[PDB]
Amino acid sequence: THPDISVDVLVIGAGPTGLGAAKRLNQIDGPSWMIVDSNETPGGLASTDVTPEGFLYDVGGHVIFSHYKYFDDCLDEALPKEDDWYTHQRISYVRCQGQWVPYPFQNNISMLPKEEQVKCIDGMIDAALEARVANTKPKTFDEWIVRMMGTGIADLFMRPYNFKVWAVPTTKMQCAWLGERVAAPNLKAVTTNVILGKTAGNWGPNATFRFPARGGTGGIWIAVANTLPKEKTRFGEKGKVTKVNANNKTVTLQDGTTIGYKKLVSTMAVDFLAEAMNDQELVGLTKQLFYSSTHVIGVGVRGSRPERIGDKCWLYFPEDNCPFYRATIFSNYSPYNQPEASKKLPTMQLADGSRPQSTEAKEGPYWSIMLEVSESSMKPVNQETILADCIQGLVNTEMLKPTDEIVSTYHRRFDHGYPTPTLEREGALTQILPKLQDKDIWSRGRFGSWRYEVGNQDHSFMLGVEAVDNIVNGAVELTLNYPDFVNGRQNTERRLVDGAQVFAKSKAQ
Amino acid sequence: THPDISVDVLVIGAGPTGLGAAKRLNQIDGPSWMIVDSNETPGGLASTDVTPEGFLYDVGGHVIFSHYKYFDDCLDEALPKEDDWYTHQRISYVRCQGQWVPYPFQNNISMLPKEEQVKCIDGMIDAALEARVANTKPKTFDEWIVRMMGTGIADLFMRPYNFKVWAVPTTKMQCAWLGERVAAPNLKAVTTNVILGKTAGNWGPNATFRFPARGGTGGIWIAVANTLPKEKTRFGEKGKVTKVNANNKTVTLQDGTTIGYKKLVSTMAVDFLAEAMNDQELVGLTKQLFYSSTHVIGVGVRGSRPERIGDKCWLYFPEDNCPFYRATIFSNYSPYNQPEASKKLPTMQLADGSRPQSTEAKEGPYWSIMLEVSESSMKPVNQETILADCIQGLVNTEMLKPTDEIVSTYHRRFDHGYPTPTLEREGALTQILPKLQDKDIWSRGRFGSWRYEVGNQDHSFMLGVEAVDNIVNGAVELTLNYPDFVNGRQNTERRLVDGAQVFAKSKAQ
Amino acid sequence: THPDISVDVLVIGAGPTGLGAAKRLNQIDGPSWMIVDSNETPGGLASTDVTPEGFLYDVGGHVIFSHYKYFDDCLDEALPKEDDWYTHQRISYVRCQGQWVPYPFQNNISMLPKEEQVKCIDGMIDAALEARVANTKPKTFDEWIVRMMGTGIADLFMRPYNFKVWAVPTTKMQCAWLGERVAAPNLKAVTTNVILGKTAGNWGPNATFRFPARGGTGGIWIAVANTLPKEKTRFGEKGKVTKVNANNKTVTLQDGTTIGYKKLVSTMAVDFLAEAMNDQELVGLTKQLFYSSTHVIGVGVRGSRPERIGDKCWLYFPEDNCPFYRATIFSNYSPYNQPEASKKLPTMQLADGSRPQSTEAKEGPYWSIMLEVSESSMKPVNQETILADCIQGLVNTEMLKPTDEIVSTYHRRFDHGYPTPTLEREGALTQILPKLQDKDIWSRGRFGSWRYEVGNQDHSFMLGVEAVDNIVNGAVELTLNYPDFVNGRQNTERRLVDGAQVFAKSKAQ
Amino acid sequence: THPDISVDVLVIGAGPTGLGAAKRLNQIDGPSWMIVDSNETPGGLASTDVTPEGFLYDVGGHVIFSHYKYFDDCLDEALPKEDDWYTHQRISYVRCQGQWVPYPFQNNISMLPKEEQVKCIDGMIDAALEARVANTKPKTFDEWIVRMMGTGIADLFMRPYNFKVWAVPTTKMQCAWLGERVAAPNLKAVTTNVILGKTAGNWGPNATFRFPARGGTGGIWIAVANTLPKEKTRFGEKGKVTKVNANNKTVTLQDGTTIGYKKLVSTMAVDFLAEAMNDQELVGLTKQLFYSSTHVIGVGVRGSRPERIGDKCWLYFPEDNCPFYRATIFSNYSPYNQPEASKKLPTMQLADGSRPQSTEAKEGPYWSIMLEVSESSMKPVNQETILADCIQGLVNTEMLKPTDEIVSTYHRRFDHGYPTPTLEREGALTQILPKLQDKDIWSRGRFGSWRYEVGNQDHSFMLGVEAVDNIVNGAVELTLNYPDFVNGRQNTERRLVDGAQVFAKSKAQ
Ligand SMILES: [Cl-]
Ligand SMILES: [Cl-]
Ligand SMILES: [Cl-]
Ligand SMILES: [Cl-]
């Protein structure tokens, strides 16, 4: 008894990873393939939401910066017109003691009060002298910090902030992931800037970036999926996978439709995957992994963009006068993230939480803020108060004046938000992934392969591409196994049009 | 006016590199392609010669050990029968003061005289204490040695030997190439073995290897080429390339035949390539590169294999009592490298270089030795005395008794022998290679891309494979740009039968 | 009501320290003075005992080596004849696994079995690499060892031996005292000797020494005291101090005699001193100090000196096959330490502990051995079995053959044997000593000032001298406060005849 | 034929050293003794001069701070009245780029311009990282500096200043003398003060000091000598030593008087001593020593003490806009160093070097400045222009306004000023001193024993004391042989009234 549908390569999930697989499969045009997703709209965590008032809110204000030329080719193909994109310079600060400290914090001590300046440069002189002599290697995130930064910067910013975002103490996670995330402060450069009162905030791959004019990031993946053959897609309740039988290589959908495959590329959360396989063993293994939930909070406000805010992009909040670890001036990314000035909206409340003087609709214009709050078994949150708490914090930090008029509110909780790089991670992955591989299953993605080091949109897209390239042309999966390798180079070899296609075209003629 | 022949991808040279290109082109079966070589017999430097007496002699006694599963697949395909191959354990020693010191030398100080033992462990204690504190990096080969080994091992073996083989002083070459060539001695392990009088010679990828039963290594590449479509090859005076016009992408052969190409894979020496292009600039660049010539000397001798020699494979000779830097007991690799016992041969001379007592042709059996002597502008040799000199050295080292009967002699000089890893190398390559790339020319191979780190047979084969995989499927050329990456891992992803081929068969059916 | 006797400077105790005080007082001939001791025979711990059979036994076989020229002057004065002294070369070994390892142990690894050789040179390479980089300081004896020697030499000899002698673990004592006691092994020198199989045993101030012909060391201090004016001494039950009243500066003897003083030099144990003062506070302070008791065991044996023993002086026994930590071939120091060959003595028992064949007395000659066994609250001993145990150990170590005839036995327990350099020591001394100083009381000596670093006979003698020189001419007490200073130099300034005397005798005439 | 005079101990020179010898000789009252000097007024380099206008000028503005309680006793005895002494807090600065940098310079980088601040903290971070790893020792003064300070502070202040004072480059002197002279900057403390803009100038034994009310320092040694028995002194042309016959221990004075001695204490310059002995050998040895001459310049000026100067004591001048290396506000030490306000004096010239408008005698009050200029064969000076040059420099540094009225000028050149701690010094001393010792000659003092480390007034006094204490009571000469020992402790043992005298007094009664 055959299955209803049979293909060479089946792709579960239409996030950036699944779509990466589809794109290369479609470019190659060899093996038969199909892609499914439980949602009518492709995009996954990189999709966009909208309030009844007309305010767009991503899942933490995503920003596009690419390590791969192939990733660029697909974006250019889906959104080829100049006015589809905005190019921005990164403006980021850290809130510490009534001060905006330029990112990255550890490179701009010259912007702290004199007292803290002293405590930071002292712990940093200590660390520099020991690091001159050490020959072992840091084993925890906390160790890495102390050795690279000093106990001063650690107690002032690093320790408190990272718990506020990762939802676990720095002592409980590894330090092999931060190659391109955490800057390592140079003693000379930092004290030279303290003496001269200068800043240095060009560090990182974030320095410059771009953002889609309309639809947010979610609009990118809708455009990208539109380049695929409709008949090879299956999005919605009709494409929801509820069972995976690795032994006879068949998938069962929600409606009972069965699909047979030779190779499986699964981009759903690995822990859900194991559950869908009824594989008691893999379940016991996945439960050894750790993740944190993400609360996204959106606030629409009336008025021209205050100068107290200016051209700021995103901001970190280590202190405990607010529940969120970051805030984004979303309205700065594109004028289409919020209604036009001519649209009339009523005031729901003032920043201080009281009612408005007038229950009528008035003109704008408007600007928008979005916040993020982390949660775990080590850091619970109260959903029915988190929204109000976030607004209070906006006042306590002077983001909003108590009299500022709030026009729109937004709150959503994403269960799987961050793949936590705990100490136990690699212990579980080096078992889980190979075991799945032996069943011809390539589990890839942010929660497919569970590796933050390489868990951005471009990374995920390429995890899908390379998985397919591995199944078809026997390419090595560099992104999955060698983060530091891909992240440290310009990946310019693989293109949306390779020689294989050019030589096929010149043949057909 | 069109060219006589036109193909998508043209491959110049049928050495291991050229044949690697052909093999993957043929496996993919997409773009049109052709391969040419100036010699009727494919194999290049990995080919075999024969004396009128029936003695086989490689080009320095080559040995097969593979980093790539794909390389294995092709070898298994060409020589699929068990009795086509012999598997050997590496037996190698170094001649120092009437002693056979187990390879690698620096790990077996426990086998030197007491006096030298002391001078070696002293310089090695010094180096170990400084290396505990250094934070810079060695810039020359000589520095690397002193830092990793000590001044004792350097003056006793490293310095004198390396000049004897590389044909230039250690102070004039870099140290980025030796990752898998030069062992780094551990202080504890070495002194622990000096106290206990033990050996340690398992180090390196040479430990175990295999060798073809018939035809030497040259037989492998003849078998491999036989798997290609004859009509797509052109070997002999008819396939010799005498002109390359990069501007209009045409090659001109010896007979005047012209070939047009879209992509060019050239495996000939890069300096000859530049000359064939009449590109004055590239010529001036190539001349900045450095290489050494190789003299191969073969000696056939009568008698059962002496016990003074036993199951020895190859031997290094640092001292100055002989001109050669290495010697191979070729007759140990396969019984088919020399005549059978029943064959009758006359004696040409005795080891001491005097006439034999009998000129009459007698039976055997026989064994065989081959030697290597390096040459450069920094180390000239006398061709008309080198043969005699080599034999004398065989006596001075007690390899041959002065009365041993010599049945066959062999001598040949290969101009391009070693690609010298000088200090100036990367300065020239980072210009030459990219400039050729801009003309759609992939120059690859031992003297195609000129990188010893990755200049073995398997390496070369894969430089050709990956070049093609780059032109067609946009794969990254890992071997060419990341020697330490490929050399440190098991490259098991790329096979002779990939999914693209598996799927295409199940589709035809 | 005046005291029966009144002097400027009173000296309690006629040990080497007390006698040092007396000697300088007598040389200066200024202030009035008197010296008392509870024993008819002066000498203290440096006195000698005798068995009814005619065997001399010191208190652990003392050996004379001087840091001070002044100490030499007094010895030359008391024993001026060439034949009063024997000069010896130090012959010392350590018993480890059926081997005699030349002193010092850590400098002669070349004399251990091959297996232990490896374990010792490994821990020593580790230590040498860390010591290259450390910048802190060792805080315990155990730390000092590990850092200077390695964990190999520590577990094999250092740790077990030191507990066997000090009667407390190495982890519970400081490391400021070992400057001239514990050798610091040089990595180069030690491995150079392991390769060549050489020894190095010239280290220390013990290398060469002398020993008195008659009476043992006790004979020296009897001769020295004989140079003092009899009327200023008071030795015996008549000189025993039973009460010290610091407030009104009076001492009360056993017979009720009272002595008044201006300055007091007390050489008795500081803890007994505090008790004699009825000073509740000082008592509580002294009890914070730590000491170990010493068991001295003497064995006289018949026969010419075996060659298994030869010219050996003293030997250390780290292993647990015997209770003693050291043994001395006392009969080697002087022919007068035991009876002459012509003396007839009966056999008491054989080494194996069995009855003798005959009771009748027979000639000699004889040789002698003395042993030392430590005791503390951390290491109890059984007095009524220790003698037998010691003999058994002499058999287990092959010092005596089970059939060797024992002629004389000796056993005595000295309560205050070693001033233990615990971690708490300096904490108590820096309080006790100054508090006594404020009452014009100079407490000096092995148990007077309780500092092993400077607790040899010459040290003690000079503690007395310098105390008097401090009271009279305001000299600094270098020996008491700066052990490393005096021990590292040739103290040649102070003589038995200073300019004062030579200038006063040229005055009279 | 006997000498005219005979004593046990003869002391040549009545400087602080000679007088120290006399004082202890007189206190002991044993051996006979006598002290001679070529000058009617005792004091040596520690004496005071006076201008016809009534201005006192020392030999570089001397300042009293004591390491020895014995030194205090003698000063208290000679000047026992409270109002004989003034107690001062040290106020010292360094002139660098129109800035007064608090002493010590290296500890107050926080007071330099921003540009120099950076160059100093950079070289200091380098040095701190290397010093973390070094295990050798600095061999030259220059090395010591670079290692302890950095190349920044070295080029800015250390190198140029030290040549200006020592009269030789820093590369030509040793670094064993600076223990209590040159501060070693702590990286943390210095950057902590740069961030906070604080100062730290409590370092050194100079922090607090005292100064005699009248007569300058010269008044101290006149008072001290007045405590000696006149008949045992011989000061003036009658006490000038012109010949020393070590062989028959006799000294010949200027008038022909001969003195016989048993022990000789010579405080004159060791090179002059050798000359007076006619000892060709010692002469050749002394000439291997190095010294620099000192020019003292005194300037008296009219007016109330400007505020531009305030309570400043002494100031260093590294820059090249003036010839002097230091300046002292002598009028701040005591109101008796210059005339009273009521005294009338004519103006000799204005600071700018031009005539005054008035050849007229007017009132005061007045203040005083004295300068020091070094000279050697490596740094010549022009005597007939140095006075003018010094005044010009006072203007260029803004010490004096060009219009300031000069009332008194003073200039004198002292040939032997500084005992240069060259590299060759200890090579010569370890020969010269012992050779003299073998002739019963204690050569002590600034130029007697030639050791700057211990060349202050208190040091010199004690060199004399200890020399006598050595000759008489056999005390060790700690000061002469162990600078770091005496300088690092409180020498409280030796008093002007020792027990020998207390006991001798209670006996006479
Ligand atoms: Cl690949
Ligand atoms: Cl074969
Ligand atoms: Cl690739
Ligand atoms: Cl002394």
For residue B448, give the DSSP letter. Answer: T
HEC string of C410-452 equals EEEEEEEEEECCECCHHHHHHHHHHHHHCCCEEECCCCCCCCH
Q: Two tokens at B392?
A: 């004398």
Instruction: Select from A327, D97, B155 the least CA-distant residue to D105.
Output: D97
**Calpha distance C440→D352 (Å, rounded):** 67
Q: What are residue D50's DSSP bridge partners?
A: D56
How far is the CA of B457 from the CAs of B17, B75, B414, B484, C182, in angstroms? 8, 12, 17, 17, 60
Element at C192 (helix H, strand E): helix C187-196
Does residue A2 lie within any of the structural domains? no
For residue C499, give the DSSP letter. Answer: H
Burial D85-106 (b: 16+ CB within 10 A, else e): beebebbbbbbbeeeebbbbbb
The phi and psi torsions of D484 (rounded to 5 degrees) equal -60, -25
Question: Strands, E, within D267-319: which ranges?
Answer: 291-302, 314-316
- The C-alpha angle with vertex C280 and arms to C279 and C285, in degrees rounded to 5, equals 100
Instruction: Select from A506, A489, A21, A493 the least CA-distant residue to B473.
Output: A493
**How many other C-beta atoms are found inside a 10 Å radius of the C-beta of residue C430?**
10
Instruction: Select from A42, A37, A24 the least CA-distant residue to A222.
Output: A42
What do you get for the CA distance between the two ends of chain D, in Å? Answer: 43
User: How much is the CA Rg of chain B, to the nearest whole Å?
Assistant: 24
Give the torsion through C-alpha atoms of B225, B231, B232, B236, to 10 deg: 70
User: How much is the CA Rg of chain D, to the nearest whole Å?
Assistant: 24
Which chain A residue shows the shortest CA-CA distance from B136?
A132
**Calpha distance C18→C237 (Å, rounded):** 17
Q: Give the distance (Å) from ligand 4 centre to CA of residue D74.
A: 21
- Burial tier of B6 (Cβ tally within 10 Å: 0-12, 13-18, 19+): middle
- The C-alpha angle with vertex B68 and arms to B62 and B69, in degrees rounded to 5, equals 115
Distance from CA of C146 to the nearest CA of A (A): 19
Question: Is the Cβ–Cβ distance between A504 and B30 less than 8 Å?
Answer: yes
Question: Is the Cβ–Cβ distance between B409 and B387 less than 8 Å?
Answer: yes
Q: Two tokens at D66?
A: 């004591």
The amino acid occupying position B317 is F
What do you get for the CA distance between the two ends of chain C, in Å? Answer: 43
Question: Is the Cβ–Cβ distance between B33 and B454 less than 8 Å?
Answer: no
**How many other C-beta atoms are found inside a 10 Å radius of the C-beta of residue C484?**
13
Q: Please indicate whether, in this complex, the C-beta atoms of D196 and A114 are within 8 angstroms of each other.
A: yes
Question: Is the Cβ–Cβ distance between A97 and A112 less than 8 Å?
Answer: yes
**Calpha distance B365→B304 (Å, rounded):** 6
Distance from CA of C126 to the nearest CA of A (A): 13
Instruction: Please report, in range form, the residues annotated as the binding site of A for NADH.
Output: 67, 90, 92, 418, 446, 456
Q: Across the B/C interface, how many CB contacts are shorter than 8 Å? A: 40
Does residue C231 lie within any of the structural domains? yes
**Calpha distance C169→D341 (Å, rounded):** 77
Which residues of chain A are within 8 Å of residue B474 when distances are taken between CB atoms?
Answer: 493-495, 498-500
Instruction: Select from C57, C20, C61 the least CA-distant residue to C42.
Output: C20
Q: Two tokens at A464?
A: 């899908």
- DSSP H helices in B380-508: 383-396, 425-437, 457-473, 478-481, 483-487, 499-508
Element at D275 (helix H, strand E): helix D270-277
Q: Give the distance (Å) from ligand 1 centre to CA of residue A475.
A: 4
Range of the domain at B178: 8-509
**Residue C479 CA: which ligand is closest?**
4
User: Which residues have CB under 8 Å from A184's CB, separation 6+?
Assistant: A148, A149
Chain-centroid distance, C-alpha C178: 15
Q: DSSP for B40-53?
A: SS--GGG--EE-TT
**How many other C-beta atoms are found inside a 10 Å radius of the C-beta of residue A105?**
26
Helical pair B457-473 and B16-28, crossing angle rounded to 10 deg: 40
Q: Across the A/B interface, how many CB contacts are shorter than 8 Å? A: 74
Find out whether the peptide bond into C3 is cis, omega within 30 degrees of 0.
no
Give the count of domains, chain C: 1
Strands C441-443 and A361-362: unpaired
Q: DSSP for A310-366?
A: TT--EEE--SSSSS-SEEE-GGGT-TTSS--TT--EE--EETTSPPPS--SEE---E
Element at D429 (helix H, strand E): helix D425-437
**Calpha distance A229→D369 (Å, rounded):** 98
On whether D326 is known to bind a ligand per the annotation, the reply is yes
Element at D76 (helix H, strand E): helix D69-78
Q: Give the distance (Å) from ligand 4 centre to CA of residue D31.
A: 19
Distance from CA of A60 to the nearest CA of C (A): 47
The amino acid occupying position D356 is P
Helical pair B218-225 and B69-78, crossing angle rounded to 10 deg: 80
**Calpha distance D462→D479 (Å, rounded):** 7
On whether D295 is known to bind a ligand per the annotation, the reply is no
Element at C371 (helix H, strand E): strand C366-375
Q: Two tokens at C9?
A: 């400077």
Does residue D2 lie within any of the structural domains? no
Q: Tokens 């959360």 identify what position?
A: A269
- Burial tier of C175 (Cβ tally within 10 Å: 0-12, 13-18, 19+): buried
Question: Is the Cβ–Cβ distance between A173 and A422 less than 8 Å?
Answer: yes
Which chain A residue shows the shortest CA-CA distance from B263?
A499
On whether B459 is known to bind a ligand per the annotation, the reply is yes
Question: Is the Cβ–Cβ distance between A375 and A290 less than 8 Å?
Answer: no
Question: Is the Cβ–Cβ distance between C49 and C278 less than 8 Å?
Answer: no
Distance from CA of C9 to the nearest CA of D (A): 10
Question: Is the Cβ–Cβ distance between C458 and C68 less than 8 Å?
Answer: yes
CATH number of the domain encompassing residue C418: 3.50.50.60
Q: Two tokens at C306?
A: 């075996």
Question: Is the Cβ–Cβ distance between D446 and D60 less than 8 Å?
Answer: no
Element at C119 (helix H, strand E): helix C114-131
Which chain D residue shows the shortest CA-CA distance from A120?
D192
Q: Please indicate whether, in this complex, the C-beta atoms of B122 and C196 are within 8 angstroms of each other.
A: no
Question: Is the Cβ–Cβ distance between B440 and B10 less than 8 Å?
Answer: no
Q: Please indicate whether, in this complex, the C-beta atoms of C191 and B128 are within 8 angstroms of each other.
A: no
Helical pair D16-28 and D457-473, crossing angle rounded to 10 deg: 40
What do you get for the CA distance between the two ends of chain B, in Å? Answer: 43
Which residues of chain A are within 8 Å of residue D187 when distances are taken between CB atoms?
Answer: 125
**Calpha distance C144→C124 (Å, rounded):** 13
Q: Two tokens at D294?
A: 């000192």
Tell me which of B28, B73, B130, B473 to substitute to probe the interface with A (most A C-beta atoms closer than 10 Å): B473
Instruction: Select from B296, B290, B279 the least CA-distant residue to B450.
Output: B290
Does residue B365 lie within any of the structural domains? yes
Helices then strands, each counted (H, E), chain C: 16, 19
Residues within 5 A (CB) of ion ligand 1 = A 475-476; B 475
Q: Please indicate whether, in this complex, the C-beta atoms of D125 and A191 are within 8 angstroms of each other.
A: yes
Chain-centroid distance, C-alpha C474: 29
Instruction: Select from D421, A227, C363, D320 the least CA-distant residue to D429.
Output: D421
Distance from CA of C133 to the nearest CA of A (A): 6
Q: Please indicate whether, in this complex, the C-beta atoms of B473 and A132 are within 8 angstroms of each other.
A: no
**Residue B336 CA: which ligand is closest?**
2
Sign of CA dihedral D443, D445, D448, D453: positive
Which residues of chain C are within 8 Å of residue D263 when distances are taken between CB atoms?
Answer: 499
User: Which residues have CB under 8 Å from B411's CB, separation 6+?
Assistant: B295, B296, B297, B298, B383, B386, B387
The amino acid occupying position A91 is I
HEC string of C79-115 equals CCCHHHEEEEECCEEEECCCCEEECCHHHCHHHCCHH
Q: What are residue B409's DSSP bridge partners?
A: B299
Does residue D310 lie within any of the structural domains? yes
The amino acid occupying position D333 is Y
Question: Is the Cβ–Cβ distance between B468 and B21 less than 8 Å?
Answer: yes
Chain-centroid distance, C-alpha A53: 26
Tell me which of A111, A112, A124, A195 to substitute to probe the interface with D (most D C-beta atoms closer than 10 Å): A195
User: Phi-psi region for residue B55, left (φ > 0), alpha (ψ -120 to 50) or beta?
Assistant: beta
Question: Is the Cβ–Cβ distance between C345 and C339 less than 8 Å?
Answer: yes
The phi and psi torsions of C350 (rounded to 5 degrees) equal -100, 160
Q: DSSP for B146-164?
A: HHHT-HHHIIIIIHHHHHH
- The C-alpha angle with vertex A25 and arms to A19 and A30, in degrees rounded to 5, equals 165
Q: What are residue C253's DSSP bridge partners?
A: C241
Element at A410 (helix H, strand E): strand A405-419
**Residue C485 CA: which ligand is closest?**
4
Does residue B138 lie within any of the structural domains? yes
Q: Please indicate whether, in this complex, the C-beta atoms of C196 and B114 are within 8 angstroms of each other.
A: yes
**Calpha distance A20→A228 (Å, rounded):** 11
For residue D498, give the DSSP letter. Answer: -
Q: DSSP for B35-83?
A: EEESSSS--GGG--EE-TTS-EE-SS---B--SBHHHHHHHHHHS-SGG
Which residues of chain C are within 8 Å of residue B122 when distances are taken between CB atoms?
Answer: 188, 192
User: How much is the CA Rg of chain C, to the nearest whole Å?
Assistant: 24
Q: What are residue D185's DSSP bridge partners?
A: none
User: Which residues have CB under 8 Å from B282's CB, separation 6+?
Assistant: B273, B274, B432, B435, B436
For residue A64, give the DSSP letter. Answer: B
